[PDB]
Amino acid sequence: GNCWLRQAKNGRCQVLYKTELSKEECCSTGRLSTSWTEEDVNDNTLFKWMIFNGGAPNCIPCKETCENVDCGPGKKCRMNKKNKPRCVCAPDCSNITKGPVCGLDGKTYRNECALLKARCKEQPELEVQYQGRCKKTCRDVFCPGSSTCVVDQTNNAYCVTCNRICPEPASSEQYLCGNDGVTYSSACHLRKATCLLGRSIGLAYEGKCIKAKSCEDIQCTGGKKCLWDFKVGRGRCSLCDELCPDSKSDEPVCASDNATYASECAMKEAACSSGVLLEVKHSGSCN
Amino acid sequence: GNCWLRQAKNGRCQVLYKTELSKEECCSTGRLSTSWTEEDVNDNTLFKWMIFNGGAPNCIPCKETCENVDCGPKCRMNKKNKPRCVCAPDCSNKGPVCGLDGKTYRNECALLKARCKEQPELEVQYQGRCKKTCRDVFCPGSSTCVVDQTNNAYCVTCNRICPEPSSEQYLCGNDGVTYSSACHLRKATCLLGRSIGLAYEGKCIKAKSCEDIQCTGGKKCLWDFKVGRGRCSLCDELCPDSDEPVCASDNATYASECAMKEAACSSGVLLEVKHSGSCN
Amino acid sequence: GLECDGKVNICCKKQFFVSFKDIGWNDWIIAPSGYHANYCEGECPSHIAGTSGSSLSFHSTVINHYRMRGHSPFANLKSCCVPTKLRPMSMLYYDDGQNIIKKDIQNMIVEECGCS
Amino acid sequence: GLECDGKVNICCKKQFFVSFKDIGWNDWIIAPSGYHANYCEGECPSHIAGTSGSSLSFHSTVINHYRMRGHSPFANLKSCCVPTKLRPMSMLYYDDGQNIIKKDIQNMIVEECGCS
Ligand SMILES: [Ir+3]
Ligand SMILES: [Ir+3]
Ligand SMILES: [Ir+3]
Ligand SMILES: [Ir+3]
């Protein structure tokens, strides 16, 4: 006959393995969902069977019970609502019981085990980054070990480890100037300062920091244009090629100047065209 | 520079051809989308540029005007002057048509239009508003009007030449007629223009009950008290835990069309569907 | 999102018309009679894999970075030009019971190609 | 739906954990440190593709009928084992202005393999 890999919703056999075989020969391997099919058909039929019958008809599961169903650590066999063996997630809980916790995915888990559970079930990369509710600012976020606090464009804290070893340059072209007016030896150094501070500083322009009065004194590399901030007295090089494609999926913004812009993209057209820096203020519209 | 092949809603260059080129070299082949990047970058930059800028920055589109644009069989200067090759089939050369897709197209040309768009297979099966019964039909030429499960008139051609067959290639129609091959059943189904359906294999047996019918292939038998004949259908599917609940021929509301069959299967009585929703 | 229009030589989509008689489906498929299935063809350079923007791009660049260093598993692995986007199509046909059905079959048409 | 069990030796989903160090990406990628990207490897018979259940099954089958009947285009076509279903993953990296950014990068993880 034919032996199979799994049982689709239909209760059908998909994923064919062997040919001209017997039930038991197939049902020998202790694989949870492996099933057996009875009839020997022309392969074409098998095919049509997947257009028509959405799989292969008359699917005999090789496991109606849970014996020697090996799920692996963390997964156990929980008999069903219809009685089919389904390996559910069962990590080790009492070994690390402790208050709510913060996952590396930004979501808050009731406790650690609730997190581990969630790891096994759908995400292999989840871990606790810091204790307690995941918060927005780095204020009272006690990061563990050597990890440091840091936040992103949308202001989410994350405990992270900062590289503090950077090579001396051996070039004056690797030099960078930051929005903070500081001259950095490498992009390595700049990052190191970004991490240690816990907030984005931003690149102003490549080269040494020169003391500019207006965008006149600034040399932009990379087809970037100069945008100036008269409130802070500094310059910056930016890409100004974005297009701002139509969409009413446009969540307009209120810029540094308090002018409702159609979209962040449109905020930047503006700034670029006018040579004046526009960052985002609030969310919404400018009332 | 770097020659690229696409421009996005973004305005950035995606799809690299080869490096160390000149702008004019690139824009040589008269292709609409092709673009150019002057900066020469080979490293990971190109990669991150994907994540960061969603495409390479500073895309110089090769064609600013339709000037020099072979679409092969149309170029229209569109609104923001972004040359765009549009669909314009030979029309001139009547009747609100019914597309082979079951959709009513306003003009015959309206169709040709849609065809060039995304329906490479589209055609006109029959003229006039797409109907829901074979009642009115003037199937172009040879055709025979036919209808589907939800009733949509289709104009098709039927094979009449089926190789004269074996003792059991035979099949029993739900009309009660013994047919020689699937072909003859098909042939009869097409000619009739409606669905006949296979009852069971072999010759039509005159049965009083399903006990008198040998279903082949795991299938079971269901009695159509409606016609007083037997029918062999599959009875293994599983009605899963999105379900659009129904109303049966037994005048019992069943949760899934599937649940209807579990019952019909366990009762030995054919349950067909009356309406959508709940009985009442 | 690349059409083999000509001689580029890149993993591009090539038009292909599938007739249902050739295949022997001419009988259970009432209509249409055939369709443009298209297929993917082309050589898969690297500059093209991470630069193609296909669903298989990030992944293909990760693996390939391991191949430019020589990890063991990937030496014999070539990044093949295959479909990354497949659109479905409507067909009028006969089911197991020879009934007439108009259903939508998924992933019949190749809409995008990509190295991976 | 074929996760690579242990000598089934078919087109299957293999496991691999990428270390951003190894790739030289420890640099601009802040978190995480690595991930389970996995790869596709195995072989592509004519009886596993159509039965595979993947999004490629149908199309790969049509092409294959042609490959069997020896049609030149396909006579030389391969039928690789590639990812057919990929899922997104979040990343925290430095962009180009060196700003700390958190974004969902799509198709970073190979979820389902198939023939094609
Ligand atoms: Ir905000
Ligand atoms: Ir096309
Ligand atoms: Ir057949
Ligand atoms: Ir895994």
| CA–CA dist C37, C15 (Å, integer) | 7
Please answer whether residues C20 and C26 qualify as being in contact, where contact means their C-beta atoms are separated by less than 8 angstroms. Answer: yes
Could you state, in order of their start, the residue ranges of all structural domains in chain D?
1-116
| CA–CA dist B212, B9 (Å, integer) | 67
C-alpha B65: how far from its chain's center? 38
Question: How many CB atoms within 10 Å of residue B64?
Answer: 12
| CA–CA dist B253, A190 (Å, integer) | 69
Which burial class, exposed, middle or buried, applies to A258 when counting CB atoms under 10 A from its CB (0-12, 13-18, 19+)? exposed
Indicate yes or no: CB of B10 within 8 angstroms of CB of A222. no
| CA–CA dist C82, D60 (Å, integer) | 10
Distances (CA, A) of C101 to B148, B236, C91, C98, D7: 5, 21, 8, 9, 41
- Based on the domain organization, do B51 and B16 belong to the same domain? yes
Please answer whether residues A32 and A71 qualify as being in contact, where contact means their C-beta atoms are separated by less than 8 angstroms. Answer: yes
Number of domains in chain A: 4
Please answer whether residues C89 and C104 qualify as being in contact, where contact means their C-beta atoms are separated by less than 8 angstroms. Answer: yes
Q: How many C-alpha atoms does D111 have within 13 Å on its Cβ side?
A: 14
Indicate yes or no: CB of B51 within 8 angstroms of CB of D105. yes
| A58 contacts on B by Cβ (under 8 Å) | 217-218, 234, 236
Q: Pick the last residue of a domain from B47, B71, B93.
A: B93
What are the DSSP E strand ranges found in chain C? 12-14, 17-19, 29-31, 34-36, 39-41, 81-94, 100-115
- Based on the domain organization, do A143 and A185 belong to the same domain? no
Q: Pick the last residue of a domain from B110, B135, B165.
A: B165
| CA–CA dist A234, A211 (Å, integer) | 8
Helix (H, G, I), strand (E, B) or coil at D59: helix
Which burial class, exposed, middle or buried, applies to B135 when counting CB atoms under 10 A from its CB (0-12, 13-18, 19+)? exposed
Indicate yes or no: CB of A48 within 8 angstroms of CB of C105. no
**Experimental method, per PDB record:** X-ray
Please answer whether residues C111 and C86 qualify as being in contact, where contact means their C-beta atoms are separated by less than 8 angstroms. Answer: yes
Q: How far is A95 from chain D (nearest CA, A)?
A: 25
Please answer whether residues B83 and B70 qualify as being in contact, where contact means their C-beta atoms are separated by less than 8 angstroms. Answer: no
Ligand 2 centre to CA of C15 (Å) is 6
Q: How far is B182 from chain A (nearest CA, A)?
A: 14
Question: How many CB atoms within 10 Å of residue A91?
Answer: 19
What are the DSSP E strand ranges found in B91-250? 97-99, 104-105, 124-127, 144-147, 153-156, 171-173, 178-179, 198-201, 220-224, 229-233, 246-248
Q: How far is B26 from chain D (nearest CA, A)?
A: 28
Q: Which amino acid is at B11?
A: G
Which residues, 6 or more positions from A167, have their beta carbon under 8 angstroms from its beta carbon? A186, A188
Residue whose pair of structure tokens reads 């050739």 in the numeric block: C22
Q: What is the CATH number of the domain that holds B3?
A: 3.90.290.10
Indicate yes or no: CB of B31 within 8 angstroms of CB of C5. yes
Q: Choose the mutation target among B39, B48, B49 for the interface with D, i.e. most D CBs under 10 Å.
A: B48
The domain of A106 spans 97-170
| CA–CA dist B32, A188 (Å, integer) | 41
| CA–CA dist C30, D37 (Å, integer) | 44
Please answer whether residues B102 and B130 qualify as being in contact, where contact means their C-beta atoms are separated by less than 8 angstroms. Answer: yes
Question: How many CB atoms within 10 Å of residue A187?
Answer: 20
Ligand 1 centre to CA of D103 (Å) is 16
Q: What is the CATH number of the domain that holds A118?
A: 3.30.60.30
Instruction: Using alpha carbons, select from D79, D82, D60 the residue that is nearest to residue D14.
Output: D82
Q: What angle do CA B110, B115, B117 make, to 5 degrees?
A: 100
CATH homologous superfamily of C1-116 = Cystine-knot cytokines (2.10.90.10)
Which two tokens mark A142?
């006690």
| CA–CA dist A69, A72 (Å, integer) | 9
Indicate yes or no: CB of D58 within 8 angstroms of CB of C107. yes
Residue whose pair of structure tokens reads 């009083």 in the numeric block: B208
Distances (CA, A) of A241 to A270, B52, B56: 12, 14, 10
Q: Which amino acid is at C81?
A: C
C-alpha B238: how far from its chain's center? 26
Q: Which backbone phi and psi does A99 adopt, to 5 degrees?
A: 95, 170
Helix (H, G, I), strand (E, B) or coil at C65: helix
Which burial class, exposed, middle or buried, applies to B118 when counting CB atoms under 10 A from its CB (0-12, 13-18, 19+)? exposed
Helix (H, G, I), strand (E, B) or coil at B170: coil
What are the DSSP E strand ranges found in B72-186? 97-99, 104-105, 124-127, 144-147, 153-156, 171-173, 178-179
Resolution, expressed in angstroms to one decimal:
2.8
| B12 contacts on A by Cβ (under 8 Å) | 241
DSSP secondary structure string for all residues of A134-175: --SSSTT----TT-EEEE-TT--EEEE---------S-SSS-
| CA–CA dist B131, D81 (Å, integer) | 45
Helix (H, G, I), strand (E, B) or coil at B111: helix
Strands D12-14 and D39-41: antiparallel
Out of C6, C10, C101, whose CB is closest to B148?
A: C101
Instruction: Using alpha carbons, select from D94, D14, B45, D86 the residue that is nearest to residue C50.
Output: B45
Q: Pick the last residue of a domain from A62, A77, A96.
A: A96
Which residues, 6 or more positions from A271, have their beta carbon under 8 angstroms from its beta carbon? A227, A238, A255, A277, A278
**Is the CB of residue B147 less than 8 Å away from at least one CB of chain C?**
yes
- Based on the domain organization, do A88 and A14 belong to the same domain? yes
